[PDB]
Design a protein around this ligand. Structure first.
Ligand SMILES: CCCCCCSc1nnc(COc2cc(F)c(C#CCNC(=O)CC)cc2F)n1-c1cccnc1
Ligand SMILES: CCCCCCSc1nnc(COc2cc(F)c(C#CCNC(=O)CC)cc2F)n1-c1cccnc1
Ligand SMILES: Nc1ncnc2c1ncn2[C@@H]1O[C@H](COP(=O)(O)OP(=O)(O)O)[C@@H](O)[C@H]1O
Ligand SMILES: Nc1ncnc2c1ncn2[C@@H]1O[C@H](COP(=O)(O)OP(=O)(O)O)[C@@H](O)[C@H]1O
Ligand SMILES: Nc1ncnc2c1ncn2[C@@H]1O[C@H](COP(=O)(O)OP(=O)(O)O)[C@@H](O)[C@H]1O
Ligand SMILES: Nc1ncnc2c1ncn2[C@@H]1O[C@H](COP(=O)(O)OP(=O)(O)O)[C@@H](O)[C@H]1O
Lengths: 549, 549
């Protein structure tokens, strides 16, 4: 017995499921009278152990309609001739009792791709499912929900309209999502109040709901370990501590890892520092078009869907993209350059189709291509010994973007660091056409940069950031954060040494730690760190701008 | 009849199995009351003949719960329709008697990958296993342990949560592990006390437990050979000698060989010699973060998970990595450069996924990439005629490291010998960012180098190491150990000649050997050996440092 309370983190997708499953069953009269056909099939997918079955059970219980789970493994387990008979009688009994939510779990196993169905019985059961789904077009209220993984894995015949009209990408839960999952799974534990259940959540990046349940179980198991060997005083005094969740997190690998995260970033224009002019430009390029479509219709100009950041390597490209995504409260589909390089090397571009389809599934998206044309940098860079500017994977990206100029809800951003090797085919209308030269931080900006970076970390009042900013003239944002991290490392090394010697003194014959960062650490760090981008590079970018501006 | 005593070397993994199999069966009450779901499936894998079946039997006998071994071969041997019936009735009788440890041996054979299951009956039995494992979710206490090899070989559907939650990488036993195995298998032998049973253990690198049992049997068989043809005086006087284990070791090839070893090194900061500053740096980069996480949380700086050693080719890179791993009592997943070159040439990067997954399975790891960007050296080196700095396999390594910044228990080390060809994509936060320029040994250091190398070998008092160190100014550590080995070779050649002439004199008409190394051998060796790294190379590394520092 579960319900809407049990599901956590899944809110947008759960909201869609609520929308799509409540009205056709709880209130079928108005749909029948109006004549609009409700979605017969609802294919919700995602990585394994994401709560697909749990979501289906919860929505079925909340609706109160008749429910009949169907599992792909058990259907396939039966002898030939009995699997299709079982499916047929399941659909029949659903029809006889039909305010109904049929649920086909692991649809991929029962109905994989056409060419990877090796046996004849496999194709027979697939066709049986097809004909049952088509024949349940009758007005009897049955909704055939299906759970799978990698929706491209199932036979595309099922994805055709009239069988599975609507798709739901559950995806990985975000930070708040993982916090909700942990709250749900740690409700009946009597956990010690010392743990927060939120510090662990932010550190469980890439964990899926099943992995979070496993982490909670492993933390409880570590709590058992800490206890020796009595029946009442051990089960009553059990209180999982933060030191137990730490162990569970350490000894628990994520499963749905390195799958492109569909999440809202958490920079909100404050992690980024100043630049005082590109914030307004990004707002006007992506905030005004959505806030005031009427004006854009009046003067008759299609808003630019693409922006290609270019500048010194590391000055706030990814930070700008994340910040503008957060301001719009939109998903941010990060695509690092290494994955594009793997795309080019793997000789497989269908994964680009997959990535763009997943971006399209997330309605408000800020699809971000970091290190764009890193493929050009790989194939000889400026020399171009491999060939011309155009290359393999960027061609597929161009095709998809040309096809993705109609969604008008996925703002594509590019962050090439070497604009001179950018293939000109992508600087065309309908593609990343708007060019914003985010420059190296200025004197007035570096103080804000350091204030943002030193945030969330104690800092003494002695340090004067203005003089440090003037001292670091041509330093890039990456170099500024490197200086901050180096100073922090020096300060923590000093603190650790102080604590070690204090403990040694206390334990020996005898029987403040400077909990702040002071200017000596900052200057010591400055001695080491140096600007990583040469004057030649910024001159080259300025020359590119002059070619444009 | 076996038990915990029989299992040897497997302690960490056996400890995990004890944890995971005792409490759910011996004390099921507290788990039921608390509500945390114990791990239903426990997939323990490793190379063949590693004791997987033996470990399962031992834990089952120690628990005392009902046990029912299931073998993949015999299940598959039955006629179609009888294999699934056999599996079903096995699960049923386990349920009827269910404090239970079901054991599916050779899970790969019964349930291989989805696409490599050719017949329809194969898929039917796989689905039968899936549905049985899902349907045994009931509170009846059955634990479905499974033994396999290369866990990527089994159908990934089984690895999903709720079926096989927990994975156990048994791995090769270490030196102490092989010693324990030999002790177990040589308990009832009446072996002669002359043999130590530990000299053989250190020389059986890559041997698996089954191979160790075979080695013991072959040693006993050689002992039989030495005996001619009586029933009592031959079986009672049998005493295997070290000369028999020597033969067995010689005529016994390892099976689980050249599989990346998950073992703790044995250098413990003493095999390495001095350098007097990078020991502290490594300690502060990997020892302080784990010892004092609270300070790292206070000042708010994510500790650097990666370090990229760079310097003259051969000065203690691998030695430093092994030493820092040993100091932390952590596994050391060595990855030599040749295997990366094979990765690049093989056109297969899924093995990089496999390597990183295996590293993640070992919780405390010091993953070490020796000769990093040797691929760059292969594709034209500094010229880069092949193309840009970025290449094929290092891209996959970068992706995995980006995904491996959350484990916070696998410290990644790189030991590039040519930093100028290192792809800059790996010198970024979240990757191998901290750079430590381990230099050529100094005058004060070479004496320690020679003291360490000459250790465990007799040395005369006449040799003066300080003058030799001054004589070898720019010599690298590889060159110093080469000098030591050459001097030892000259000394042992002299000793062998002396012994040969002494034996010849004794055997002829007539009827100290200098058991030490003296300065004449050292100077004779010095005449030959010369520094292998030129002044140009060290100047280049210094220039790289100046570009950084
Ligand atoms: C959203 C959260 C931040 C990140 C992603 C969302 S971005 C977003 N959300 N909604 C929109 C608005 O889309 C459009 C509105 C229009 F009026 C028009 C028009 C017109 C006039 N036609 C003609 O004259 C001839 C036919 C075209 C649009 F595409 N955009 C958007 C689209 C494009 C660029 N920037 C923003
Ligand atoms: C272990 C045996 C030797 C070889 C392998 C083991 S190495 C090991 N074992 N435990 C650890 C500690 O991990 C971490 C601890 C932390 F406090 C933090 C933090 C923080 C602050 N967050 C923020 O401000 C914003 C979110 C991050 C960690 F990743 N490490 C380790 C990790 C990284 C580098 N060096 C060592
Ligand atoms: N959104 C969620 N809310 C609560 N629990 C979840 C959620 N997602 C996953 N889980 C947990 O993960 C597990 C998923 O198990 P299962 O249903 O077998 O796999 P799947 O969810 O992929 O079908 C459940 O035990 C559930 O408690
Ligand atoms: N304008 C900025 N404000 C604050 N931090 C910045 C800024 N630019 C760069 N950084 C720092 O640099 C890091 C991110 O670098 P990024 O700008 O993403 O590199 P790239 O532009 O090559 O993607 C962050 O840790 C961030 O703190
Ligand atoms: N950790 C261990 N302790 C004792 N013996 C072992 C160990 N590992 C392997 N062996 C030996 O290796 C053999 C393994 O045989 P078998 O069980 O058929 O293969 P596997 O162990 O891979 O299932 C046994 O005879 C056992 O004596
Ligand atoms: N600092 C050192 N102390 C002791 N031995 C060293 C040192 N540096 C190199 N060696 C010797 O060199 C050999 C290992 O070479 P290594 O440093 O691994 O080469 P590389 O650094 O190219 O991987 C060992 O036999 C070791 O005795």
């Amino acid at each position: 017995e579960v319900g809407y309370d049990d599901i956590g983190g899944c809110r947008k997708q759960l909201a869609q499921i609520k929308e799509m499953v409540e009205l056709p069953l709880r209130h079928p009269a108005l749909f029948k009278a109006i004549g609009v056909k409700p979605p017969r099939g609802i294919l919700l997918y995602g990585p394994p152990g994401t709560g697909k079955t749990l979501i289906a059970r919860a929505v079925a219980n909340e609706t109160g309609a008749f429910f009949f789970l169907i599992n792909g493994p058990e259907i396939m387990s039966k002898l030939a001739g009995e699997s299709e008979s079982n499916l047929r009688k399941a659909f029949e009994e659903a029809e006889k009792n039909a305010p109904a939510i049929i649920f086909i779990d692991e649809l991929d196993a029962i109905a994989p791709k056409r060419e990877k169905t090796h046996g004849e019985v496999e194709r027979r059961i697939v066709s049986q499912l097809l004909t049952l789904m088509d024949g349940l077009k009758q007005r009897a209220h049955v909704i055939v929900m299906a759970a799978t993984n990698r929706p491209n894995s199932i036979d595309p015949a099922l994805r055709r309209f009239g069988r599975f009209d609507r798709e739901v990408d559950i995806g990985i839960p975000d930070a708040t999502g993982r916090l909700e999952i942990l709250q749900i799974h740690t409700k009946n534990m009597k956990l010690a109040d010392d743990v927060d259940l939120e510090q662990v959540a932010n550190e469980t990046h890439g964990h899926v709901g099943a992995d979070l349940a496993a982490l909670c179980s492993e933390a409880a198991l570590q709590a058992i370990r800490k206890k020796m060997d009595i029946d009442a005083e051990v089960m009553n005094s059990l209180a999982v501590t933060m030191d137990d969740f730490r162990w569970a997190l350490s000894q628990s690998n994520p499963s749905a890892l390195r799958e492109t995260v569909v999440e809202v970033p958490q920079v909100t224009w404050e992690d980024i520092g100043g630049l005082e002019d590109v914030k307004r430009e990004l707002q006007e390029l992506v905030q005004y078009p959505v806030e005031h479509p009427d004006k854009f219709l009046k003067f008759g100009m299609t808003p630019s869907k693409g922006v290609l950041f270019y500048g010194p390597p590391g000055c706030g490209k990814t930070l700008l993209a994340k910040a503008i995504a957060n301001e719009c409260q939109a998903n941010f589909i990060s695509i690092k350059g290494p994955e594009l390089l793997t795309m080019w090397f793997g000789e497989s571009e269908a994964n680009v189709r997959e990535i763009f389809d997943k971006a399209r599934q997330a309605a408000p998206c800020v699809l971000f291509f970091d290190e764009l044309d890193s493929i050009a940098k790989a194939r000889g860079g400026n020399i171009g010994d491999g060939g011309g500017a155009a290359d393999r994977v960027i061609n597929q990206i161009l095709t998809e973007m040309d096809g993705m100029s109609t969604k008008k809800n996925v703002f594509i951003i590019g962050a090439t660091n070497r604009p001179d090797i950018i293939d000109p085919a992508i600087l065309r209308p309908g593609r990343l056409d708007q060019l914003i030269y985010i420059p190296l931080p200025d004197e007035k900006s570096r103080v804000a940069i350091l204030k943002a970076n030193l945030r969330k970390s104690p800092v003494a009042k002695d340090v004067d950031l203005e003089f440090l900013a003037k001292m670091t003239n041509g330093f890039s944002g990456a170099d500024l954060t490197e200086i901050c991290q180096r100073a922090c490392k020096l300060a923590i090394r000093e603190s650790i040494e102080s604590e070690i010697r204090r403990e040694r003194e206390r334990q020996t014959n005898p029987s403040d730690p400077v909990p702040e960062i002071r200017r000596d650490h900052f200057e010591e760090a400055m001695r080491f760190a140096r600007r990583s981008v040469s004057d030649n590079d910024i001159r080259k970018y300025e020359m590119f701008a002059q070619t444009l501006q």
